[PDB]
Amino acid sequence: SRSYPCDEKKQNDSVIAECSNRRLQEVPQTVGKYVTELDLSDNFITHITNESFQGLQNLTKINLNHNPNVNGLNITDGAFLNLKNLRELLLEDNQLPQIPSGLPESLTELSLIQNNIYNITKEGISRLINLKNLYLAWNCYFNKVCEKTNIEDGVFETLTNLELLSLSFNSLSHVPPKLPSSLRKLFLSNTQIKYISEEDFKGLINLTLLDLSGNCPRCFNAPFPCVPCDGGASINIDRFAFQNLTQLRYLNLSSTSLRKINAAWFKNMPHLKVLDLEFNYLVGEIASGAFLTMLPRLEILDLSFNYIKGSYPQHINISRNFSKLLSLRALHLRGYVFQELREDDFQPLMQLPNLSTINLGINFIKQIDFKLFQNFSNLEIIYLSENRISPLFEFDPHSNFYHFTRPLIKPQCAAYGKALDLSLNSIFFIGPNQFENLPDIACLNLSANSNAQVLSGTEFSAIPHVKYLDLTNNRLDFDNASALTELSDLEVLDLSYNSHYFRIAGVTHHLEFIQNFTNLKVLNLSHNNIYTLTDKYNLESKSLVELVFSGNRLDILWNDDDNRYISIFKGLKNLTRLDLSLNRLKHIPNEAFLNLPASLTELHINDNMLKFFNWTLLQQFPRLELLDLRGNKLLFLTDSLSDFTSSLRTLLLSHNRISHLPSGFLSEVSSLKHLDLSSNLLKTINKSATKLSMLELHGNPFECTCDIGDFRRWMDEHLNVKIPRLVDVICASPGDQRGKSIVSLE
Amino acid sequence: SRSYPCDEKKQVIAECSNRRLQEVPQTVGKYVTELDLSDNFITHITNESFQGLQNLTKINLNHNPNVGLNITDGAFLNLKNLRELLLEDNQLPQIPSGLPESLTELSLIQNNIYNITKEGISRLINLKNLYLAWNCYFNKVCEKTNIEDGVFETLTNLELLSLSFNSLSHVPPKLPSSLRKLFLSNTQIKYISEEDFKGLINLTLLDLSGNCPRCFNAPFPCVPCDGGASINIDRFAFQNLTQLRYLNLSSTSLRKINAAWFKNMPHLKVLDLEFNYLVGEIASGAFLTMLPRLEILDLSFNYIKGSYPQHINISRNFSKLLSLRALHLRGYVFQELREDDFQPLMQLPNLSTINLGINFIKQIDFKLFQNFSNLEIIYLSENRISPLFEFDPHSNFYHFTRPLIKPQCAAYGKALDLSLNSIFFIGPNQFENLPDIACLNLSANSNAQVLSGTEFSAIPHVKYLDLTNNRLDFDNASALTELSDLEVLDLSYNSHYFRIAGVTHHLEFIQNFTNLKVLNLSHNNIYTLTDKYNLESKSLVELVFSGNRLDILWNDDDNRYISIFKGLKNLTRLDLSLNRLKHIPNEAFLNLPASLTELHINDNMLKFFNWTLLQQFPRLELLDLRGNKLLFLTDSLSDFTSSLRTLLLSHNRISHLPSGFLSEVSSLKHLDLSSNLLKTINKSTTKLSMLELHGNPFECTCDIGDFRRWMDEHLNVKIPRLVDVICASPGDQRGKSIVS
Ligand SMILES: *[C@@H]1O[C@H](CO)[C@@H](O[C@@H]2O[C@H](CO)[C@@H](O[C@@H]3O[C@H](CO)[C@@H](O)[C@H](O[C@H]4O[C@H](CO)[C@@H](O)[C@H](O)[C@@H]4O)[C@@H]3O)[C@H](O)[C@H]2NC(C)=O)[C@H](O)[C@H]1NC(C)=O
Ligand SMILES: *[C@@H]1O[C@H](CO)[C@@H](O[C@@H]2O[C@H](CO)[C@@H](O[C@@H]3O[C@H](CO[C@H]4O[C@H](CO)[C@@H](O)[C@H](O)[C@@H]4O)[C@@H](O)[C@H](O)[C@@H]3O)[C@H](O)[C@H]2NC(C)=O)[C@H](O)[C@H]1NC(C)=O
Ligand SMILES: *[C@@H]1O[C@H](CO)[C@@H](O[C@@H]2O[C@H](CO)[C@@H](O[C@@H]3O[C@H](CO)[C@@H](O)[C@H](O)[C@@H]3O)[C@H](O)[C@H]2NC(C)=O)[C@H](O)[C@H]1NC(C)=O
Ligand SMILES: *[C@@H]1O[C@H](CO)[C@@H](O[C@@H]2O[C@H](CO)[C@@H](O[C@@H]3O[C@H](CO)[C@@H](O)[C@H](O)[C@@H]3O)[C@H](O)[C@H]2NC(C)=O)[C@H](O)[C@H]1NC(C)=O
Ligand SMILES: *[C@@H]1O[C@H](CO)[C@@H](O[C@@H]2O[C@H](CO)[C@@H](O[C@@H]3O[C@H](CO)[C@@H](O)[C@H](O)[C@@H]3O)[C@H](O)[C@H]2NC(C)=O)[C@H](O)[C@H]1NC(C)=O
Ligand SMILES: *[C@@H]1O[C@H](CO)[C@@H](O[C@@H]2O[C@H](CO)[C@@H](O[C@@H]3O[C@H](CO)[C@@H](O)[C@H](O)[C@@H]3O)[C@H](O)[C@H]2NC(C)=O)[C@H](O)[C@H]1NC(C)=O
Ligand SMILES: CCCCc1nc2c(N)nc3ccccc3c2n1CC(C)(C)O
Ligand SMILES: CCCCc1nc2c(N)nc3ccccc3c2n1CC(C)(C)O
Ligand SMILES: *[C@@H]1O[C@H](CO)[C@@H](O)[C@H](O)[C@H]1NC(C)=O
Ligand SMILES: *[C@@H]1O[C@H](CO)[C@@H](O)[C@H](O)[C@H]1NC(C)=O
Ligand SMILES: *[C@@H]1O[C@H](CO)[C@@H](O)[C@H](O)[C@H]1NC(C)=O
Ligand SMILES: *[C@@H]1O[C@H](CO)[C@@H](O)[C@H](O)[C@H]1NC(C)=O
Ligand SMILES: *[C@@H]1O[C@H](CO)[C@@H](O)[C@H](O)[C@H]1NC(C)=O
Ligand SMILES: *[C@@H]1O[C@H](CO)[C@@H](O)[C@H](O)[C@H]1NC(C)=O
Ligand SMILES: *[C@@H]1O[C@H](CO)[C@@H](O)[C@H](O)[C@H]1NC(C)=O
Ligand SMILES: *[C@@H]1O[C@H](CO)[C@@H](O)[C@H](O)[C@H]1NC(C)=O
Ligand SMILES: *[C@@H]1O[C@H](CO)[C@@H](O)[C@H](O)[C@H]1NC(C)=O
């Protein structure tokens, strides 16, 4: 039949049963017997048993993370022992008190993150001689009630294929002895280890990663309960502790209260590539550090948040030895805290051939001598967000704890070239010299600078090749029709969240500049509360392909007593994508609709208040593939869609008030592959109501009398029409056979 | 049994509006006088409709049908002390024939009536107020309005006539001299002669606005007179309007104002001259000589297009406006205000409001405000100061009428409003030489400074400070403490720095204030503080903490914020709404102030609520738990409180009420259970005044009989919106109001 309650789907070619997040109270045994990998995460399962998977042994991989989704998960001894194929077991966030007993010797990956396991035992682990990755992090941390972690002596010795061990966010006090030398990655972050001896990593010649962050933490202003070493002292790492760590590429010493870095740590580390020294006390070492001479293959240096409490120095003080970091590509210096960036201050960085990212986020910087960036060899990313420049469980266990890892710049903007991010500063107006002597900036972010100026056509004269311009969340005054026109190569413009002046009827508003661009493809005017323009009422462009106009007031613009804005988007001759969501539309006048550009392939009018839609108007849009009408108040479909379109591929109608499907609504429009009727008021689906590929029906108040059998037997026949979330296609009616999926009835 | 579908009240109105009603409902009582059926689906009125209702003094059928109303020739005729009939927004193509002569008020606003006839109107000999406005305007498809000669002659008790937003072209002749108020705004009248206002000697208000409009940048379809010319008002046109108190000539394209216009208006009090071309008159202004009793003068939006002069130019003759209380000069547009510039206003004894909003002012010489006699409201919002149907037919069309300053702030004394400027940083001298400001608005100034306890030293008696929508860096434990008398502090929407984990955040200054009553910390994304984790005050009564991250502050692995509100020792109102809460750790709940009388935790994601903890809140009268995901009420509420008066549980997932009621909590007058998942109420006295139940999926089999009988019995237990307490089961009953 149609698989249930999981959604099968095949890949490499494995056969995954996505079965997560479904209010499942037990491993379903209708799981069906072809599945390898299954995912039962985020369900209400509270027991596991040798029964649970008793007829399923092609399973390479099981994910039971986050069960039950609030007791704990109760897993009996040997439960999994019969799965001889089982390579990957994920058991995160299950409130386990122990490593389950009698796990299969086949396991290569075992995750036990975010439980209550305080004992690491031979009996739990030592039989798992095929383990490559073992995750035991986040069992005892912060102000959780938990025990010190007891690691049986030698427990890791038999694991001679162990490559990744993670024990972070456990109370360990010492690095465990008897680590197998197969290890490539060892994570010991936040484990309350004060001291690293010579002996602790002696044998680990294969190690490429070592993480000792958060041992002797810097606790000032911590966003979590933080226990420093006595007197807030430094971690203590024996001079010889890394002497055989010859293969190390990654070394994380964040928040280890370091004031000094022992250059000898790096003697026998010729491959070190990433060094993380955030949240320490290294302003001295940054000015004067001899370790900078030991790292000719380093590519990423993170020295963020090394500020001294009570100091806002004039300038940043970079050692001349920075010039020896020949391989350096990214330098992170957020939160050093200083007032002013001078050209001379960064001289030591200027001849590094590969330095493409400089990160100065969050430094309370007031002035920058911008011309210094030109004198670098090869800067691609100049990141100055969140400064003071002016004119002119809460933590994800699978992510970096000490900073976000999202790119500094959106890839869509960075793709165009050199990027300068000055977002979240106080450049509240751009004077004639603001951008003098910058490199050829292609991507510029001026978001959240509370800019209130009248852009006039001259402000970006010195960086006239910007291709992607972010001016979101300012308060721009559009009084001048020449605004931004000096940017001939402009392709993407984001003017979102500039409501300030748009809201005021009494002031002028001029959007004429849009037409002057010959290369403009994407324009976002969202959340601007646009409701009146001055003189020219129409948006015009031969180029534009995408216009986002959500969060404006087309309800006023297209008011019944006003003809002025009736052709507002018609002049966008190239438009394929239009977004009119969140415009408080109760209806669209037929004439306004008919003046939407005939080029559209994609139209969103979701999250308005439409009670009626004139389906017949779709005749004037022969290219239209996607029509999105979700989150309105629509009552009525049409029985003759196929007269009105032969292009429509996707029709999205969730969150409306549709109670009937018309006979032959659907069956005639053979372009239509995806129909979404979820969260409507449908009691039933008549026989009459097949080129359809996906049909969504969840959250409709179905009647489960015998007149639903029409539908069921259809479902049975068209097994290649994906119906998602069958678990949420539920009977509201009658008393029985109620509450249960329509798919389980006689 | 129980009133339906209307809702009655004493002081006798039958609130029957907005109900999906398709016709007038027959079930309505003789005692009822005022029927309000506005916003319904009603499409037909006849003499049947109001058969036997008799006693109505007032009917409202505005907005019917809610996407024309067909009214028959004598429908209202029989009830003959009907004084007020309201028929707005009904797409009437005509005035209804055969209206009772009892009418003192008729409103036909927002219809399609283009013919005003004797046949319709002249019988209505008792009309005092007649509204015919907004029948033909803008780009509406409509006709010039035909006013049958002398139609208003017979109405000798007519006091108010409104014909605005109709194409008239001429003031109609033969108006009754009984008139007090004549509204002719936006009527396309180009010409006002001596003969139009005859006398009309009792007129107190005349509105000629929007005739010959100033159309530049108009927010509606605007048609000017030829070449954008001025309305033409004969020098003697108002010579017999001796009683006039209100004159509205906004948007009539005036470049000149004739002093003679005012010679015979010795009582003129409000003069509205907005959206004209009066910069020249403002500078030279001989008419200012003729208005010794004028109290409000609005000269807003008289800017010269494309002109941004250095200074504003105010005639010396403004010194003759001896009764002036409020002067509105928005939208003149000028760069700088200097002390000289306002000399002519400075000896005016009663000038309390000066409104300079929306002028793109870049600098003000602030000491000038001191030299005025007695300013109470100094309104400089929306400038560029830096560190030193769409229109409601019942409101003003040319400007908002809300107060300039919130009454709660202005009530403390002298007000200075500098909101929406660019005072991004307050320097030591910013507030020198100001008067004794009690109410200060600095909202939306992009302010990112670290307030330090010295910024308001020159105005140390501020009692109500609005710092909302800035980007304040809260990095100093002494911030704002120089304001000893401060009672109301609004810090909403200062997210910028709070949301950054790695910068420091300091809210300790709170405890310093001895008179602080109300503090608003809403929409700040507060989730981590530096060193001091607790909010403390002996004085504070109300804390708004909505739109922060208590979900994080009270995270299970963190004990630091577990007492965060405990030190607010005098707190009685607390708002914890919109904090993304799934559960509150019992210990965190028990540390809320025991002084609480009102607690809001609405619009979180609560799955569970520990009812027994209410034992520690003996003063608690309101508990608001709306918009969560709660499943289960307790059956022993009465063990956990004897104080609770209001319990709000709308929009949760409750599907069963336990016996007895929940309990019998004898203090409980108001229970809201609307929009839950309730199938039934079975058995099973109360002290409830009100039970809300609308929007639960009721089963309408014979088991719902239990509850009905209860309803029949406890008739003084108000159950609102019975139209919306409907069955979702079974099919045949489903749709219907349980009560039938
Ligand atoms: C100290 O420094 C080291 C850097 O050397 C840092 O090691 C990195 O840790 C993170 C885990 O915190 C690793 O990132 C993960 O890698 C795995 C395997 O490749 C991925 O599956 C993860 O991606 C999934 O989960 C992400 C987060 O939920 C999702 O965003 C994503 O879409 C996936 O579903 C994730 O990328 C990273 O591999 C290591 N680095 C190396 C080189 O091994 C360590 O975390 C730092 N210590 C602390 C406490 O911050
Ligand atoms: C020209 O200037 C004239 C004199 O200033 C303006 O005259 C005023 O006209 C207004 C608008 O009609 C009258 O408005 C008052 O407002 C209340 C509102 O009552 C109900 O409706 C509003 C809906 O907003 C609601 O807010 C309330 O709470 C009520 O539900 C009326 O009920 C009042 O009686 C009155 O209508 C003023 O009365 C009137 N002033 C005087 C002195 O009569 C005129 O509007 C200006 N012309 C234009 C086109 O703007
Ligand atoms: C210009 O700078 C602004 C401000 O730094 C950048 O805004 C940031 O943009 C990222 C999105 O790429 C935001 O992260 C996202 O936030 C949303 C909201 O919860 C979340 O749903 C996404 O998954 C993601 O986490 C971040 O919120 C936002 N920051 C602020 C303060 O608004 C913007 O991207 C920059 N522009 C370019 C072109 O790089
Ligand atoms: C202003 O509107 C623009 C254009 O819609 C927004 O930028 C666009 O953001 C969407 C994400 O919502 C991007 O979609 C893409 O989706 C796929 C995966 O589903 C992925 O390949 C991409 O990484 C991206 O997520 C689209 O690329 C992006 N377009 C551009 C030109 O950047 C923008 O976010 C809106 N601004 C604000 C403040 O909302
Ligand atoms: C300080 O200045 C700010 C900005 O001028 C004032 O904010 C403004 O407050 C008004 C009046 O409360 C807001 O309008 C109101 O809006 C609600 C619904 O959104 C409506 O129910 C009311 O009828 C009313 O018109 C207005 O949005 C707001 N402006 C902005 C930009 O937020 C603030 O009240 C002033 N504070 C004091 C103490 O006077
Ligand atoms: C920040 O929080 C305070 C909330 O305490 C807000 O001011 C308060 O706003 C409420 C209305 O939500 C006011 O109550 C109302 O006042 C009048 C009584 O004159 C009445 O018409 C209403 O039924 C209601 O009682 C309360 O007076 C007012 N308190 C003060 C001190 O002004 C403020 O609006 C919030 N700020 C923001 C930006 O949301
Ligand atoms: C990277 C920031 C570390 C701590 C800190 N928070 C702030 C803050 N909120 N505002 C400032 C304003 C001016 C200068 C510094 C800060 C600041 N800092 C850095 C220190 C603790 C050195 O004041
Ligand atoms: C009361 C404003 C009338 C028309 C107008 N809109 C604006 C505007 N958006 N920005 C300005 C910035 C500096 C100076 C004037 C304006 C402005 N004005 C006034 C005119 C059209 C004369 O420029
Ligand atoms: C610089 O980077 C490039 C990789 O793009 C590499 O080819 C070259 O070896 C690097 N040079 C140095 C000195 O590291
Ligand atoms: C825009 O500003 C430019 C440069 O100041 C000015 O010369 C021009 O007249 C303004 N343009 C308009 C109003 O189109
Ligand atoms: C229309 O858009 C396409 C796709 O971006 C673009 O290549 C083409 O040049 C555009 N046409 C015009 C007239 O700009
Ligand atoms: C929809 O548009 C059609 C065809 O253009 C028009 O004739 C018809 O009146 C409209 N239908 C509705 C319900 O408005
Ligand atoms: C004012 O009008 C009355 C008629 O209502 C008239 O008697 C009187 O002469 C007029 N006063 C003048 C024109 O000054
Ligand atoms: C000023 O206002 C007071 C209070 O209303 C009033 O009694 C007095 O007559 C006024 N003075 C003038 C010149 O109008
Ligand atoms: C607050 O700010 C002022 C000025 O920086 C300073 O004198 C005072 O010491 C500050 N207090 C704290 C706690 O930083
Ligand atoms: C507590 O609040 C009341 C009511 O506002 C106030 O009268 C009293 O002074 C406050 N107590 C303290 C200690 O501030
Ligand atoms: C409610 O809180 C009390 C503490 O007074 C505790 O004993 C009880 O376990 C709690 N009940 C639930 C269901 O959390």
PDB file of N, CA and C in Angstrom, chain A residues 368 370 373 382-387 389-390 409 419-427 434-435 438 443-449 463 470, chain B residues 471:
ATOM      1  N   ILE A 368      37.630  55.083  10.814  1.00  0.00           N
ATOM      2  CA  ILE A 368      38.498  54.250  10.036  1.00  0.00           C
ATOM      3  C   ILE A 368      39.118  55.073   8.947  1.00  0.00           C
ATOM      4  N   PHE A 370      39.879  54.584   5.744  1.00  0.00           N
ATOM      5  CA  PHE A 370      39.481  53.578   4.735  1.00  0.00           C
ATOM      6  C   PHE A 370      40.513  53.261   3.647  1.00  0.00           C
ATOM      7  N   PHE A 373      42.709  49.877   3.187  1.00  0.00           N
ATOM      8  CA  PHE A 373      42.297  48.579   2.653  1.00  0.00           C
ATOM      9  C   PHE A 373      42.813  48.365   1.232  1.00  0.00           C
ATOM     10  N   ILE A 382      35.768  42.756   3.698  1.00  0.00           N
ATOM     11  CA  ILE A 382      36.102  43.726   4.718  1.00  0.00           C
ATOM     12  C   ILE A 382      34.913  43.906   5.613  1.00  0.00           C
ATOM     13  N   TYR A 383      35.019  43.369   6.812  1.00  0.00           N
ATOM     14  CA  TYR A 383      33.847  43.212   7.625  1.00  0.00           C
ATOM     15  C   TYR A 383      33.924  44.067   8.889  1.00  0.00           C
ATOM     16  N   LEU A 384      33.109  45.136   8.891  1.00  0.00           N
ATOM     17  CA  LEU A 384      33.094  46.157   9.918  1.00  0.00           C
ATOM     18  C   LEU A 384      31.741  46.323  10.566  1.00  0.00           C
ATOM     19  N   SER A 385      30.899  45.317  10.480  1.00  0.00           N
ATOM     20  CA  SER A 385      29.565  45.404  11.019  1.00  0.00           C
ATOM     21  C   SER A 385      29.621  45.585  12.538  1.00  0.00           C
ATOM     22  N   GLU A 386      28.646  46.315  13.072  1.00  0.00           N
ATOM     23  CA  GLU A 386      28.434  46.432  14.548  1.00  0.00           C
ATOM     24  C   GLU A 386      29.584  47.137  15.221  1.00  0.00           C
ATOM     25  N   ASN A 387      29.770  48.391  14.805  1.00  0.00           N
ATOM     26  CA  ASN A 387      30.741  49.296  15.339  1.00  0.00           C
ATOM     27  C   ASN A 387      30.089  50.681  15.574  1.00  0.00           C
ATOM     28  N   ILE A 389      30.966  53.616  13.553  1.00  0.00           N
ATOM     29  CA  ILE A 389      31.418  54.426  12.489  1.00  0.00           C
ATOM     30  C   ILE A 389      30.306  55.417  12.156  1.00  0.00           C
ATOM     31  N   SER A 390      30.712  56.641  11.897  1.00  0.00           N
ATOM     32  CA  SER A 390      29.769  57.665  11.520  1.00  0.00           C
ATOM     33  C   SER A 390      30.407  58.477  10.412  1.00  0.00           C
ATOM     34  N   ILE A 409      29.135  37.331   5.128  1.00  0.00           N
ATOM     35  CA  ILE A 409      28.421  38.085   4.112  1.00  0.00           C
ATOM     36  C   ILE A 409      27.444  37.101   3.446  1.00  0.00           C
ATOM     37  N   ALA A 419      33.647  42.657  -1.007  1.00  0.00           N
ATOM     38  CA  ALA A 419      32.521  43.034  -0.189  1.00  0.00           C
ATOM     39  C   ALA A 419      32.983  43.889   0.976  1.00  0.00           C
ATOM     40  N   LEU A 420      32.212  44.927   1.271  1.00  0.00           N
ATOM     41  CA  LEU A 420      32.458  45.811   2.404  1.00  0.00           C
ATOM     42  C   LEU A 420      31.154  45.826   3.214  1.00  0.00           C
ATOM     43  N   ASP A 421      31.183  45.379   4.456  1.00  0.00           N
ATOM     44  CA  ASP A 421      29.991  45.341   5.293  1.00  0.00           C
ATOM     45  C   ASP A 421      30.118  46.402   6.400  1.00  0.00           C
ATOM     46  N   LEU A 422      29.316  47.458   6.309  1.00  0.00           N
ATOM     47  CA  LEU A 422      29.288  48.502   7.298  1.00  0.00           C
ATOM     48  C   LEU A 422      27.936  48.517   7.947  1.00  0.00           C
ATOM     49  N   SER A 423      27.259  47.370   7.979  1.00  0.00           N
ATOM     50  CA  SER A 423      25.979  47.334   8.627  1.00  0.00           C
ATOM     51  C   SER A 423      26.080  47.644  10.118  1.00  0.00           C
ATOM     52  N   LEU A 424      24.971  48.113  10.680  1.00  0.00           N
ATOM     53  CA  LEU A 424      24.860  48.317  12.134  1.00  0.00           C
ATOM     54  C   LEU A 424      25.929  49.272  12.629  1.00  0.00           C
ATOM     55  N   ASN A 425      26.143  50.335  11.870  1.00  0.00           N
ATOM     56  CA  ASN A 425      26.931  51.501  12.313  1.00  0.00           C
ATOM     57  C   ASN A 425      26.047  52.759  12.430  1.00  0.00           C
ATOM     58  N   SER A 426      26.638  53.943  12.386  1.00  0.00           N
ATOM     59  CA  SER A 426      25.887  55.160  12.553  1.00  0.00           C
ATOM     60  C   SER A 426      26.255  56.123  11.393  1.00  0.00           C
ATOM     61  N   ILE A 427      26.385  55.584  10.189  1.00  0.00           N
ATOM     62  CA  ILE A 427      26.644  56.405   9.002  1.00  0.00           C
ATOM     63  C   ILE A 427      25.302  56.919   8.518  1.00  0.00           C
ATOM     64  N   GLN A 434      32.870  60.014   1.594  1.00  0.00           N
ATOM     65  CA  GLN A 434      32.742  58.856   2.450  1.00  0.00           C
ATOM     66  C   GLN A 434      33.483  57.645   1.898  1.00  0.00           C
ATOM     67  N   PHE A 435      33.462  57.429   0.582  1.00  0.00           N
ATOM     68  CA  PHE A 435      33.981  56.187   0.018  1.00  0.00           C
ATOM     69  C   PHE A 435      35.229  56.392  -0.787  1.00  0.00           C
ATOM     70  N   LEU A 438      38.479  53.515  -1.645  1.00  0.00           N
ATOM     71  CA  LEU A 438      38.151  52.146  -1.411  1.00  0.00           C
ATOM     72  C   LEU A 438      38.562  51.361  -2.626  1.00  0.00           C
ATOM     73  N   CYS A 443      30.038  44.469  -3.520  1.00  0.00           N
ATOM     74  CA  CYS A 443      28.982  44.115  -2.587  1.00  0.00           C
ATOM     75  C   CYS A 443      29.107  45.043  -1.382  1.00  0.00           C
ATOM     76  N   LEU A 444      28.058  45.828  -1.127  1.00  0.00           N
ATOM     77  CA  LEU A 444      28.088  46.824  -0.062  1.00  0.00           C
ATOM     78  C   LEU A 444      26.890  46.683   0.830  1.00  0.00           C
ATOM     79  N   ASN A 445      27.138  46.543   2.139  1.00  0.00           N
ATOM     80  CA  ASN A 445      26.072  46.468   3.117  1.00  0.00           C
ATOM     81  C   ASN A 445      26.065  47.710   3.996  1.00  0.00           C
ATOM     82  N   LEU A 446      25.001  48.506   3.869  1.00  0.00           N
ATOM     83  CA  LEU A 446      24.785  49.702   4.696  1.00  0.00           C
ATOM     84  C   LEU A 446      23.548  49.567   5.546  1.00  0.00           C
ATOM     85  N   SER A 447      23.133  48.343   5.810  1.00  0.00           N
ATOM     86  CA  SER A 447      21.955  48.096   6.607  1.00  0.00           C
ATOM     87  C   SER A 447      22.080  48.697   8.020  1.00  0.00           C
ATOM     88  N   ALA A 448      20.950  49.120   8.591  1.00  0.00           N
ATOM     89  CA  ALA A 448      20.863  49.542   9.988  1.00  0.00           C
ATOM     90  C   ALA A 448      21.948  50.571  10.312  1.00  0.00           C
ATOM     91  N   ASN A 449      22.027  51.627   9.524  1.00  0.00           N
ATOM     92  CA  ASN A 449      22.862  52.785   9.837  1.00  0.00           C
ATOM     93  C   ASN A 449      22.032  54.052  10.171  1.00  0.00           C
ATOM     94  N   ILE A 463      32.630  54.399  -5.757  1.00  0.00           N
ATOM     95  CA  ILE A 463      32.532  52.954  -5.861  1.00  0.00           C
ATOM     96  C   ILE A 463      31.372  52.688  -6.796  1.00  0.00           C
ATOM     97  N   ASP A 470      22.829  46.564  -0.143  1.00  0.00           N
ATOM     98  CA  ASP A 470      21.911  46.366   0.981  1.00  0.00           C
ATOM     99  C   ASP A 470      21.799  47.692   1.775  1.00  0.00           C
TER     100      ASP A 470
ATOM    101  N   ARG B 471      18.706  52.768  20.076  1.00  0.00           N
ATOM    102  CA  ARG B 471      19.606  51.595  20.093  1.00  0.00           C
ATOM    103  C   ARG B 471      20.543  51.700  21.263  1.00  0.00           C
TER     104      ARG B 471
END
